[PDB]
Amino acid sequence: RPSELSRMSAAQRQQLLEEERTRFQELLASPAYRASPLVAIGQTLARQMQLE
Amino acid sequence: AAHKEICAVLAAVTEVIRSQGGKETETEYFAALMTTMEAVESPESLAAVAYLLNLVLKRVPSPVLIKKFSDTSKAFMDIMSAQASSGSTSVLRWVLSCLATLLRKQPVTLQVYHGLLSFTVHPKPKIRKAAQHGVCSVLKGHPAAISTAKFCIQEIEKSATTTLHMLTLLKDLLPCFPEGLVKSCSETLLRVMTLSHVLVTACAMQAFHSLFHARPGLSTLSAELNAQIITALYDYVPSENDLQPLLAWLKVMEKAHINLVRLQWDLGLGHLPRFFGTAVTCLLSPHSQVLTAATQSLKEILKECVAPHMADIGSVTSSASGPAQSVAKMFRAVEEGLTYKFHAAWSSVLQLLCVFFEACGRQAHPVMRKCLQSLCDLRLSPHFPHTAALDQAVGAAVTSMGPEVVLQAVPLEIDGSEETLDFPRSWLLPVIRDHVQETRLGFFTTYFLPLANTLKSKAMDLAQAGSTVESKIYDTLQWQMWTLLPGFCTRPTDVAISFKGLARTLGMAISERPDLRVTVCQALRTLITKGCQAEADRAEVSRFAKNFLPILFNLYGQPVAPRRAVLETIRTYLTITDTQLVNSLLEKASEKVLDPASSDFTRLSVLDLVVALAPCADEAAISKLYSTIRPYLESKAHGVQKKAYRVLEEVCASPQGPGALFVQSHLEDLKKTLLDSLRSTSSPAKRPRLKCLLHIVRKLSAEHKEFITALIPEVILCTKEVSVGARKNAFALLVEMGHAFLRFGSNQEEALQCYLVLIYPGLVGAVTMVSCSILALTHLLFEFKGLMGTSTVEQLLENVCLLLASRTRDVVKSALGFIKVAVTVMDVAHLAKHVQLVMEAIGKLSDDMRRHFRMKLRNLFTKFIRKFGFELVKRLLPEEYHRVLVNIRKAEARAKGDSIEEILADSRQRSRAWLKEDEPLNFLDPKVAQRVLATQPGGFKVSADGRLIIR
Amino acid sequence: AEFIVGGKYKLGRKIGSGSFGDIYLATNITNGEEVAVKLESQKARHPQLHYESKLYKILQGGVGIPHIRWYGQEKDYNVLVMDLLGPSLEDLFNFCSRRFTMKTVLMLADQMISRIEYVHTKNFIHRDIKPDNFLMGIGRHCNKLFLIDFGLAKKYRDNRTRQHIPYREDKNLTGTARYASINAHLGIEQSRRDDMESLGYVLMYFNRTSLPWQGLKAATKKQKYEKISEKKMSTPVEVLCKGFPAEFAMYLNYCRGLRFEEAPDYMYLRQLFRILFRTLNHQYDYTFDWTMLKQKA
Amino acid sequence: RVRTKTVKKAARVIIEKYYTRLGNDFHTNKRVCEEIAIIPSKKLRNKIAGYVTHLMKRIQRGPVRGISIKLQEEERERRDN
RNA sequence: AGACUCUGGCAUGCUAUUCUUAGAGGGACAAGUGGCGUUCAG
């Protein structure tokens, strides 16, 4: 799964689009992402980068 | 130290000291300071109170001034006499200034004006300049003009250095004078023109310039007086090449002629030929500046004084009587200005003849032809530098008339069968192509159809005759005169009657003559683009469009060709045609697409025709076509889906008409179809589809938030699509959806916050979609700059700092772009709170990331050094970056015509001439200028096969 | 970073505002010692900082004057940077909840007597004496008072010919009228006599912790100053120090009756103050009210 | 995009040698660049074809006398050999 | 505010070959259109 979209196939483009659409729907339906959006984004980014 | 203070006399005295006691103004200050004005001659105390009196006096105590004007006149008059007897400067200067203010605001007044006027000839410059400016302010702020004019006349007649002083008075005061005093002043001025002194001549020419430049009315200056002073000014013309007074003499004669034309135009045009002849003679001066000035003056007179009256004058022939004869005479002068004796001003003469053609040709053509023949003869010189200027002049004359009158004057010698191969008037065809814009199409028919047909036949006949050299030349000829049709189609005057004679000819020339087709197509487009202004013209174009449509459709749909120019012609040509035959051809094209016995190339060509026919049909045909194309959005062929999305974009492209009605009728169907076909959209098909979505975001109602929030991930993934056009469309669609949410609520900032939190979660998931959302926020930050609220931007910037720690190069690059946009956009006062965090995240980036992204980091450090202190950036960066920093600082230290040979080029002084010596050189011959020139007369390795080697 | 003064001092935050400038804090980047900053704009209504530099370099050496560090011009400003000092007397007046005792005011009186002795032995007058104008030292200078703000200072005597500035009426009130003299209110040329009258005024301000003409309001500034003046002549000397030792009263009577060209005996005033100090049985232990509230915490 | 010195130099000399055998569009120009020039680089071949196409669309819009005398001069040179 | 070098997307084509391969050959050159342009560079 390469990061660059130009070298990777359109079926995987459709799969990635469907997956990110479902993830967007779930995160938009989450009660945590209704009161403090940017705070939750910062916490998630901090967790993801301290994982890295 | 105490003049620059705000409390000083520089600023605050002009504002708050005028309000004396709370009310502005009271002269009780002045009424109390008579006692210092009388019997006291102390310096720097009289001067200071005079300064304050001058400064405060402008704040309009006008009824009080009218009342005690007698008291002020007597007081300041005795001050004048006492200071003249004593001999001081500053007190005298500001008392002159305050008397000037008093006389401006308001029998004895004539005496006060005389007392103010008498101190101009006072030898001290400070007294004289103040008196002059005061008199000028009094007159321009008139019953006193006669007295000061007589005073100036008597002061000149009495006198040598003061002569220039009241000449400066005359320069500044001539427009505000009565007519008899203007006449007497000009008589005295010509009397001092009888002297040979240079400075008086230059200053009084400046006085004439100020007199005629202001454009005085009939009361100040009459037309007869202007004619008399014009005829009197002809007697000096200093010598030929003085260039300081000759410039002023030309300028004042130009202004006098302009004023005379403005007063009475026929007399001005009658007096113009003498001035034009003298200007043409003065063009033989060796100075370049006087030549440019004469060209500019004659150009200005031609544009402003000659051009707008030619509808009144009408056509001029060789036997004109009135102002037309004068126009013929000054044309004769500018025609005589084309002989061999000039040979250095031919650039200026040809430019002035070019603007002469543009201004004059439509009514001056009967006499125009001899000059045209002469200038055609001038191009026969072996070496010509003004070839581009000559071609511009011939093009201007063609733009004035057209090729019919020009070819009556200078005929083309390419009429059929020639003997030699050196066509001498071959430049005429490029000139005609470049500059025909206002002609008749019937001349193009009756002249360029049989001649080009015979030349094409001769070219083909010589092609089968073995001679491949002459045949190529004749084919290039017939191509060149077939390129005149776009010029003739610019703005024809008889295209309502002459288009019938070219319809079948253009049809066969676009059918079985490929070599002309593109130009022919361009001609059609050119015609439409500026020829359907009238209604009978557009009716004729439709009446032949009903025949031209199958021809163009078959030309585009044939297998292999210039398909794209044909497509553009079809696009405009279908925007200008009737809807019923559009519906018929749309039905035929739908039949051709739905026919399974058609090839894929033919199917795609007919789909392109469907794309062209889609916005021009009615709502029923558009709805039927949409019903046919709707199952094709899920086709596995990327081309079919691309053409389907192009159809959906084109039907939604029209803001008004049947397309908008179809969109309003089928909005829900289009929304559910576009949401259903989102999953199975191919990569090229993203490029039109977004535009179609764009065309349905601009007119979207308030109850459509679900559609937009479902389209968002597709738009972001298209902001990181492969195609640059798809990325541009996705960025535009993001901006347009942001605009669309600025219409659904009352608070714009809260609506933008909602739009952002609908696109914010993309910073959470996969790497490429994280970079997608960073690029989306980068694009949105440049458009809605302050409207989301900078503090939120700061939070976003902080998040980007975490994304500055990412391993992937795309996320780092997008974060750097967002940081650059944030530095550009949001405020430095809020930057200074957040410099340290963002640039600390910059500092601990990597070695590889720092090395690869050296351009962006260099630009960011440059912007930070520009916006903040260099020492701060030096303090907060680590060691190695400091090296680059000083280089950046050193950077900020360092910051403070159409011939073959000309195109194939490896890319005092102008008065030089070359004679040539054949018959003896007869200078009196009219064709001598052909023998007088204006310019100086006179790598790879080939292989064994003979093919060149290129590296 | 954002601004460096002198090439080796880094600027900090504002601590106050001077008569002809703003007062900032700064740290030396070479050795780390902390300095105070007087900054003024190069284009303003009162370019008097070079005269202040001259007066500071005149007053060097003796006690009660901060030592000069640097002066210069910085890209839009002129900045004079001096040694750091502590709070003024009004800050301690606010910290102590508006109460002073007998021992502390006699310490302050002896210190300001010494300061006035030094400034009149250095041939200059102050004309803006106030509790804000007298600062307190720092470190081992924690028992020493310091005198600043020579912006409104002027020459009052000549070194060679022993001549005063000639007396002339109608002088504008340069300083504050809470401690201005009657001669200063009328427009009489200010001299040393008006100076220790202002010393007596700040002394009674420290003692009574309030003034009867403090907070007086009138039509304008001139009317306010005038009204303060006639109510100052209307106020008897002895009623200003009721319930107080008569040392301050006869000090005010002595300094009121001084002439123009006379030389007062400051040794007499110091002797009388120390006699009163020892007859009320106190010692020079430098235990001030602000100090003892620091140890009480 | 910009064009290097060698592309325009080789284009000018190839015009001066074989203007007669050229065409007007990118197809004929890349064909004659294939069959007249060695040109080992296909990238430089596309560049040379594009710029000689630019030269063609520039020069038949000029007067025909210069192009004509170029034709009989090139014919004289060809007939001489 | 990289005019440096190499190079990708599409091949139902050749090679042991439309779904995987790896050598070669193609394809893109600002090529086409309309505006702004010293009418040529852009």
Side-chain angles (χ1 to χ4, degrees), chain A, chain B, chain C, chain D residues 1-52 54-81:
Chain A
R1 264 275 284 266
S3 71
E4 277 96 348
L5 191 145
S6 178
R7 287 93 164 96
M8 61 80 71
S9 72
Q12 278 168 329
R13 293 180 179 137
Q14 290 149 22
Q15 268 154 15
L16 170 65
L17 180 47
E18 184 265 349
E19 279 148 27
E20 295 323 299
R21 273 210 286 150
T22 56
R23 195 194 75 77
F24 278 167
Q25 270 151 32
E26 297 313 310
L27 198 42
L28 277 182
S30 67
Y33 186 65
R34 292 180 181 177
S36 57
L38 271 179
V39 168
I41 293 157
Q43 291 174 353
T44 306
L45 273 184
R47 282 176 231 135
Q48 273 189 1
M49 185 63 72
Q50 75 97 30
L51 282 173
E52 286 194 4
Chain B
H3 288 287
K4 305 292 221 153
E5 310 189 345
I6 184 66
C7 178
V9 297
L10 192 140
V13 165
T14 318
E15 316 282 351
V16 305
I17 297 293
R18 271 93 165 272
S19 45
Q20 290 215 31
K23 181 250 287 181
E24 43 177 357
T25 183
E26 292 180 353
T27 56
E28 187 172 74
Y29 184 77
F30 172 55
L33 276 296
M34 320 305 188
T35 181
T36 304
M37 291 325 198
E38 291 157 271
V40 176
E41 209 63 31
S42 75
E44 295 105 10
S45 164
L46 282 191
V49 67
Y51 176 91
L52 299 181
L53 195 47
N54 181 32
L55 265 69
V56 175
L57 201 41
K58 274 82 72 175
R59 275 293 170 284
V60 58
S62 46
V64 191
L65 287 169
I66 294 189
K67 287 218 173 166
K68 54 94 178 179
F69 170 72
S70 184
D71 195 3
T72 56
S73 60
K74 265 74 174 174
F76 294 111
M77 187 66 204
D78 66 61
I79 286 178
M80 281 315 178
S81 53
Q83 202 65 269
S85 65
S86 79
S88 171
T89 61
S90 173
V91 187
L92 204 55
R93 180 198 215 209
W94 279 258
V95 72
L96 275 172
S97 299
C98 71
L99 268 182
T101 293
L102 162 72
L103 281 177
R104 168 180 104 176
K105 287 301 173 65
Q106 199 269 327
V108 74
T109 316
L110 288 177
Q111 306 319 296
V112 185
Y113 190 56
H114 275 68
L116 173 61
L117 194 67
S118 69
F119 292 166
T120 294
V121 303
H122 187 273
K124 299 289 94 175
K126 297 286 182 66
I127 301 294
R128 158 179 75 238
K129 203 175 305 297
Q132 284 177 349
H133 179 92
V135 168
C136 293
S137 65
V138 161
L139 271 184
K140 311 168 167 153
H142 206 288
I146 304 103
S147 303
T148 178
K150 286 177 181 174
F151 178 76
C152 292
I153 287 157
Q154 291 315 308
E155 277 293 322
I156 293 180
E157 287 293 330
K158 169 173 50 212
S159 171
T161 176
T162 180
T163 66
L164 304 153
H165 299 141
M166 73 291 291
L167 270 192
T168 316
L169 287 175
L170 285 181
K171 176 210 306 182
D172 292 330
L173 289 184
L174 264 175
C176 54
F177 280 159
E179 195 269 334
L181 277 298
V182 174
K183 174 165 181 174
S184 197
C185 168
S186 306
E187 290 199 25
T188 308
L189 195 145
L190 263 72
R191 278 198 287 272
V192 300
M193 290 315 178
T194 62
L195 195 57
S196 62
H197 194 97
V198 181
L199 267 177
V200 68
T201 303
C203 292
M205 294 298 102
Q206 193 64 38
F208 265 123
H209 188 284
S210 181
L211 171 63
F212 288 127
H213 166 87
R215 299 185 298 279
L218 274 298
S219 49
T220 301
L221 187 138
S222 63
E224 298 89 2
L225 187 65
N226 201 350
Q228 288 168 232
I229 194 66
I230 275 170
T231 56
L233 275 183
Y234 274 116
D235 288 0
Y236 284 120
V237 57
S239 161
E240 170 177 278
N241 51 5
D242 284 348
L243 184 68
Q244 279 312 308
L246 193 43
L247 264 286
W249 182 105
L250 270 292
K251 195 56 135 163
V252 303
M253 182 145 298
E254 178 188 3
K255 293 283 180 153
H257 272 99
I258 286 160
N259 212 60
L260 192 47
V261 166
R262 182 184 62 80
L263 292 193
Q264 207 197 340
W265 64 276
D266 47 359
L267 190 72
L269 276 296
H271 292 350
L272 272 188
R274 180 168 185 204
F275 179 51
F276 262 66
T278 60
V280 162
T281 300
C282 183
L283 284 166
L284 293 176
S285 161
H287 304 294
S288 178
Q289 311 99 302
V290 65
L291 261 51
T292 312
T295 311
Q296 196 50 243
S297 84
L298 293 200
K299 199 177 300 178
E300 192 94 338
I301 297 169
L302 273 168
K303 291 295 179 67
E304 315 300 313
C305 304
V306 177
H309 300 257
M310 271 205 187
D312 291 331
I313 290 156
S315 65
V316 55
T317 66
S318 60
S319 72
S321 72
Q325 187 183 347
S326 290
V327 172
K329 273 180 182 164
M330 52 67 78
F331 171 68
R332 180 67 189 82
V334 76
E335 157 191 5
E336 185 68 27
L338 213 60
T339 63
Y340 78 114
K341 277 192 294 294
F342 284 72
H343 80 266
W346 281 3
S347 67
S348 299
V349 172
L350 266 292
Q351 283 170 46
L352 188 153
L353 273 181
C354 167
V355 302
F356 203 102
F357 294 141
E358 174 179 17
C360 303
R362 193 168 309 281
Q363 304 95 349
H365 73 87
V367 68
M368 186 64 72
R369 42 183 292 158
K370 272 81 184 168
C371 183
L372 291 167
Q373 291 155 216
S374 297
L375 61 83
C376 168
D377 274 327
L378 294 174
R379 209 184 174 282
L380 283 191
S381 291
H383 307 97
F384 205 60
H386 310 300
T387 301
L390 188 152
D391 291 323
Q392 283 301 111
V394 179
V398 165
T399 307
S400 80
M401 320 315 268
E404 181 164 9
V405 179
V406 176
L407 285 180
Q408 289 178 240
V410 294
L412 273 192
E413 287 153 347
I414 319 169
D415 309 332
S417 86
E418 304 89 35
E419 268 316 290
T420 61
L421 289 180
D422 56 355
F423 310 93
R425 284 163 178 170
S426 54
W427 43 273
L428 273 175
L429 290 175
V431 161
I432 284 181
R433 155 169 58 77
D434 290 327
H435 288 101
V436 162
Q437 79 186 14
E438 276 162 344
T439 62
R440 51 185 291 271
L441 198 61
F443 174 69
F444 173 75
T445 69
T446 61
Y447 187 77
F448 291 111
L449 294 178
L451 196 147
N453 279 348
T454 52
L455 290 182
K456 179 60 174 191
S457 160
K458 187 194 186 72
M460 294 182 286
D461 283 2
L462 263 62
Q464 291 101 26
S467 61
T468 55
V469 164
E470 293 82 7
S471 179
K472 180 76 70 67
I473 302 169
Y474 279 110
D475 192 79
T476 317
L477 291 173
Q478 70 93 37
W479 193 339
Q480 267 194 350
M481 71 213 57
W482 269 106
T483 56
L484 314 182
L485 181 54
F488 274 95
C489 281
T490 304
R491 277 192 280 126
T493 73
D494 58 342
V495 67
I497 61 184
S498 299
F499 192 53
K500 317 183 316 297
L502 289 176
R504 202 174 195 277
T505 308
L506 197 145
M508 61 79 71
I510 211 171
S511 277
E512 69 272 15
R513 288 290 308 269
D515 198 17
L516 307 177
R517 269 185 185 139
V518 180
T519 311
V520 165
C521 277
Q522 190 185 350
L524 280 181
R525 299 197 305 273
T526 292
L527 176 82
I528 304 152
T529 302
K530 52 186 71 65
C532 283
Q533 299 110 345
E535 205 63 34
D537 300 332
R538 189 173 178 268
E540 283 287 321
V541 181
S542 306
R543 188 176 76 85
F544 287 122
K546 68 181 290 294
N547 289 86
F548 264 106
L549 260 174
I551 296 190
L552 283 160
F553 274 7
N554 294 344
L555 178 56
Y556 185 81
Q558 84 174 4
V560 62
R563 301 220 304 167
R564 297 161 71 189
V566 168
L567 197 53
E568 293 310 307
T569 314
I570 279 169
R571 279 205 167 89
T572 305
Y573 164 74
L574 272 294
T575 61
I576 62 164
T577 187
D578 50 349
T579 67
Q580 51 91 31
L581 188 153
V582 168
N583 291 4
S584 313
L585 288 189
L586 194 57
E587 162 196 351
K588 275 160 60 55
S590 290
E591 278 158 22
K592 278 193 188 187
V593 172
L594 284 183
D595 173 70
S598 47
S599 65
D600 290 329
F601 174 77
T602 303
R603 187 167 184 215
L604 286 186
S605 290
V606 183
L607 284 174
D608 290 330
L609 304 178
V610 160
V611 163
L613 286 153
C616 312
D618 75 298
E619 192 184 3
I622 285 181
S623 168
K624 179 175 63 175
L625 183 70
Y626 163 69
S627 71
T628 314
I629 298 299
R630 188 180 50 182
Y632 282 176
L633 287 176
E634 290 87 4
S635 159
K636 308 272 171 298
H638 66 86
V640 171
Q641 202 182 32
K642 199 194 189 194
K643 300 302 165 67
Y645 273 123
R646 187 76 200 281
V647 169
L648 269 194
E649 184 263 331
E650 283 296 271
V651 301
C652 290
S654 57
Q656 59 94 29
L661 295 174
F662 154 75
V663 168
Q664 289 177 354
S665 303
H666 282 102
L667 197 50
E668 277 306 314
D669 193 18
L670 202 58
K671 279 169 50 201
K672 72 97 174 178
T673 297
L674 283 182
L675 271 188
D676 179 66
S677 81
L678 161 63
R679 174 178 36 75
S680 73
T681 309
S682 65
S683 292
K686 315 293 260 190
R687 202 196 92 239
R689 166 185 162 88
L690 294 160
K691 277 157 146 289
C692 178
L693 304 158
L694 179 68
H695 281 139
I696 72 177
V697 163
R698 287 213 190 113
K699 50 206 175 193
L700 209 55
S701 174
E703 54 271 14
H704 295 309
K705 292 182 182 293
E706 310 294 330
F707 186 57
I708 290 179
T709 198
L711 288 178
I712 281 292
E714 173 207 1
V715 187
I716 309 179
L717 272 179
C718 286
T719 57
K720 255 301 195 186
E721 209 69 28
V722 188
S723 196
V724 59
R727 281 169 266 153
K728 289 178 184 178
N729 298 330
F731 281 138
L733 182 48
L734 277 173
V735 170
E736 198 60 40
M737 293 182 286
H739 282 342
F741 284 168
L742 289 184
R743 305 181 313 242
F744 297 165
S746 66
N747 192 23
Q748 274 184 4
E749 187 160 306
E750 186 264 330
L752 287 179
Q753 285 316 120
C754 182
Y755 183 50
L756 286 180
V757 302
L758 288 178
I759 76 170
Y760 278 167
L763 280 82
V764 176
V767 175
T768 183
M769 61 80 71
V770 159
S771 188
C772 279
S773 281
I774 298 164
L775 281 178
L777 278 173
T778 308
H779 187 75
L780 262 67
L781 197 73
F782 192 57
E783 285 272 346
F784 305 126
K785 311 181 183 68
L787 279 81
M788 62 295 278
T790 55
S791 179
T792 65
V793 178
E794 288 168 338
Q795 208 158 354
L796 274 184
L797 190 59
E798 189 265 332
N799 277 333
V800 160
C801 290
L802 304 190
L803 297 157
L804 210 49
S806 172
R807 287 311 106 75
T808 318
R809 269 186 205 195
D810 197 1
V811 179
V812 174
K813 181 182 178 196
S814 298
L816 288 181
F818 189 88
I819 285 173
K820 176 198 186 294
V821 164
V823 165
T824 297
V825 165
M826 61 80 71
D827 271 357
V828 290
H830 298 87
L831 271 162
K833 194 191 140 190
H834 292 281
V835 177
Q836 185 196 332
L837 194 145
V838 301
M839 82 77 78
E840 174 201 341
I842 287 182
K844 47 178 288 296
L845 194 66
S846 284
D847 173 54
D848 201 353
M849 295 299 102
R850 168 194 179 239
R851 183 167 295 276
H852 171 239
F853 290 123
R854 66 178 61 173
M855 291 66 58
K856 298 206 185 323
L857 266 70
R858 157 198 296 277
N859 188 22
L860 279 178
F861 294 154
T862 295
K863 280 180 154 49
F864 267 111
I865 281 164
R866 284 185 184 178
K867 277 185 159 38
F868 293 89
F870 172 78
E871 311 94 348
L872 172 61
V873 173
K874 178 166 281 267
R875 200 192 84 233
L876 298 168
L877 275 169
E879 206 72 13
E880 311 93 8
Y881 291 101
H882 291 131
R883 288 160 54 240
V884 183
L885 295 178
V886 308
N887 294 266
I888 285 165
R889 196 265 304 278
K890 293 192 191 194
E892 293 190 1
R894 294 149 192 157
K896 306 310 282 169
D898 277 31
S899 61
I900 284 179
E901 302 94 7
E902 192 146 356
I903 296 167
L904 300 185
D906 304 331
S907 52
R908 211 50 179 186
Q909 198 254 340
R910 316 262 199 90
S911 64
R912 277 183 295 148
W914 287 265
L915 297 174
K916 173 180 182 297
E917 272 269 7
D918 278 28
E919 300 269 6
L921 192 43
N922 185 14
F923 295 106
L924 299 189
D925 186 61
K927 297 197 297 180
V928 69
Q930 289 174 46
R931 199 179 294 171
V932 169
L933 321 173
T935 51
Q936 178 81 47
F940 292 106
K941 297 185 181 297
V942 174
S943 76
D945 191 281
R947 299 167 70 195
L948 276 155
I949 295 173
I950 314 295
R951 213 175 317 283
Chain C
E2 73 285 336
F3 182 48
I4 300 100
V5 71
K8 60 175 181 294
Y9 316 133
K10 192 49 185 160
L11 202 48
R13 266 163 283 278
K14 189 151 91 153
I15 189 65
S17 178
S19 279
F20 301 110
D22 299 65
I23 321 295
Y24 275 35
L25 188 54
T27 78
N28 305 346
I29 203 153
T30 57
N31 296 115
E33 190 276 331
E34 279 82 39
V35 298
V37 176
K38 303 176 27 193
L39 61 84
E40 196 269 331
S41 66
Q42 214 154 19
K43 42 180 74 173
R45 207 186 169 182
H46 280 94
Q48 287 301 296
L49 189 59
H50 189 93
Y51 273 120
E52 272 167 302
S53 194
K54 290 216 141 184
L55 293 174
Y56 270 101
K57 65 93 176 179
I58 281 286
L59 269 292
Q60 57 96 49
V63 65
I65 287 306
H67 285 317
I68 178 163
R69 313 292 157 180
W70 186 68
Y71 168 78
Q73 280 78 246
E74 298 82 0
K75 85 164 59 178
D76 202 4
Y77 282 175
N78 44 2
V79 175
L80 191 140
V81 63
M82 294 299 291
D83 187 58
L84 193 46
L85 282 186
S88 45
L89 310 169
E90 70 178 3
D91 314 299
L92 317 166
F93 190 78
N94 170 63
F95 291 156
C96 70
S97 277
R98 197 185 297 278
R99 56 211 152 76
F100 281 163
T101 79
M102 161 56 188
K103 201 200 80 85
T104 74
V105 298
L106 267 292
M107 301 325 188
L108 298 155
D110 212 26
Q111 289 179 355
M112 61 155 158
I113 280 299
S114 184
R115 289 307 316 130
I116 210 61
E117 284 173 354
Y118 187 48
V119 65
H120 295 285
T121 45
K122 295 293 183 182
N123 317 278
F124 282 100
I125 45 180
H126 199 254
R127 206 152 91 242
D128 59 276
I129 303 163
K130 63 181 72 175
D132 189 31
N133 218 308
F134 283 13
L135 316 188
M136 187 66 204
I138 176 64
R140 186 288 310 151
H141 289 286
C142 201
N143 65 91
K144 298 292 185 181
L145 197 152
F146 289 105
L147 198 151
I148 65 158
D149 200 90
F150 303 140
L152 305 97
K154 264 281 170 154
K155 215 172 189 41
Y156 88 103
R157 77 178 180 188
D158 192 21
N159 57 354
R160 286 206 151 208
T161 46
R162 312 279 290 169
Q163 59 103 18
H164 215 290
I165 293 281
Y167 53 93
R168 192 263 180 191
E169 188 65 26
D170 194 38
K171 272 301 154 76
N172 45 4
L173 270 298
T174 81
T176 177
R178 282 92 152 190
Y179 320 102
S181 286
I182 287 181
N183 286 27
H185 283 148
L186 290 154
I188 300 171
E189 205 268 341
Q190 189 260 305
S191 198
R192 64 221 288 192
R193 45 164 156 77
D194 297 330
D195 265 10
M196 73 291 291
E197 292 148 20
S198 165
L199 269 70
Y201 296 153
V202 298
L203 187 148
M204 61 79 71
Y205 167 83
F206 288 154
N207 295 349
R208 276 278 289 286
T209 73
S210 200
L211 270 54
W213 57 93
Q214 162 89 331
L216 194 144
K217 292 174 71 175
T220 186
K221 178 169 155 299
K222 321 298 171 93
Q223 186 60 256
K224 270 187 50 140
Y225 292 178
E226 181 67 29
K227 186 143 200 311
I228 288 174
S229 84
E230 72 269 13
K231 79 155 292 197
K232 173 149 270 186
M233 291 66 78
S234 278
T235 316
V237 176
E238 294 293 328
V239 310
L240 289 154
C241 309
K242 287 292 186 182
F244 282 177
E247 179 48 81
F248 316 136
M250 52 66 58
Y251 180 36
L252 194 149
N253 299 129
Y254 179 41
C255 74
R256 178 68 182 273
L258 294 176
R259 297 285 74 78
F260 194 27
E261 300 296 329
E262 57 89 25
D265 45 354
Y266 307 123
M267 192 46 257
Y268 182 76
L269 309 162
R270 198 263 186 277
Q271 183 64 73
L272 259 53
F273 290 148
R274 74 186 176 99
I275 292 169
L276 268 295
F277 185 74
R278 70 208 189 185
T279 51
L280 282 72
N281 311 318
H282 301 332
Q283 273 153 1
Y284 300 84
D285 57 355
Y286 321 111
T287 313
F288 311 131
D289 62 357
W290 59 272
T291 312
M292 65 184 73
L293 72 89
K294 290 215 315 303
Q295 289 93 23
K296 285 157 62 212
Chain D
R1 267 81 69 189
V2 297
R3 301 179 189 270
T4 61
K5 270 307 171 192
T6 184
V7 177
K8 65 178 72 66
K9 193 259 187 184
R12 289 185 187 103
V13 305
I14 208 60
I15 302 306
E16 291 175 353
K17 264 70 178 174
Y18 291 139
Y19 167 63
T20 305
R21 304 178 63 177
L22 290 164
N24 52 2
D25 64 335
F26 181 72
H27 296 285
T28 64
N29 296 115
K30 72 177 185 292
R31 284 196 301 106
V32 300
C33 285
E34 283 179 352
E35 58 94 21
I36 294 300
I38 293 298
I39 188 67
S41 161
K42 188 203 303 202
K43 182 64 70 177
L44 298 176
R45 161 166 88 78
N46 287 339
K47 262 70 174 176
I48 199 74
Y51 182 75
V52 298
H54 193 317
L55 286 194
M56 294 298 102
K57 65 177 71 66
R58 202 176 168 187
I59 70 162
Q60 293 83 18
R61 309 189 98 220
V64 307
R65 182 180 212 271
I67 77 173
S68 74
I69 67 188
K70 183 168 183 65
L71 273 71
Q72 70 273 15
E73 279 326 288
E74 274 194 17
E75 193 267 330
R76 179 78 43 81
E77 291 311 310
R78 193 217 42 78
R79 185 221 41 82
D80 210 309
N81 305 348

